[PDB]
Amino acid sequence: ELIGTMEQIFMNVAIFEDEVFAGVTTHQELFPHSLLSVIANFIPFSDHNQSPRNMYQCQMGKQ
Amino acid sequence: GGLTCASAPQGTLRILEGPQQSLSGSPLQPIPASPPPQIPPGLRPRFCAFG
Structure with a gap:
């Protein structure tokens, strides 16, 4: 399926399997790094790096 | 010979067309989970000391 920004707030979307449950977990994400x-x-x-460092790497890979 | 108001209806019927739910199978992924990175069999050292 394809979900939108407002339609995603009223639905449970597991990331990894074994996180999927019976009543919960209406949907599931395609790959874990989709985010x-x-x-x-x-x-x-x-x-394994702290987050402010991944924000500088993104800005440094473009220079 | 004209049209006059008749007795009030005693009930209302509202029709809609609806299909049903199937069994919950929850088939999450073709090849599922995050399959782990792993060792190539045997491998062998690709380097030796001098002497």
Whole structure:
């Protein structure tokens, strides 16, 4: 399915499987890194760096 | 010979067309979960010391 910004507030969307439940979890996300941008998906292991650092990497990959 | 108001209706029927729910199967993903990165079998050292 395709959901919108206002339609997403009234529905449960698991990220990983085994997070899906029976009554809860109406939907599920395609990939776990769907939340991140195209450039933020080019940073390696962004999960183990602190966040202000991933914001500077995004701005430094464009210079 | 004209039209006059008749007795008030005693009830109302509202019709709509509706289909039903299937069983909950919840088939989340073709190849599901985040499959883990892993070791290539055997591998072997690709480097040796001198001497």
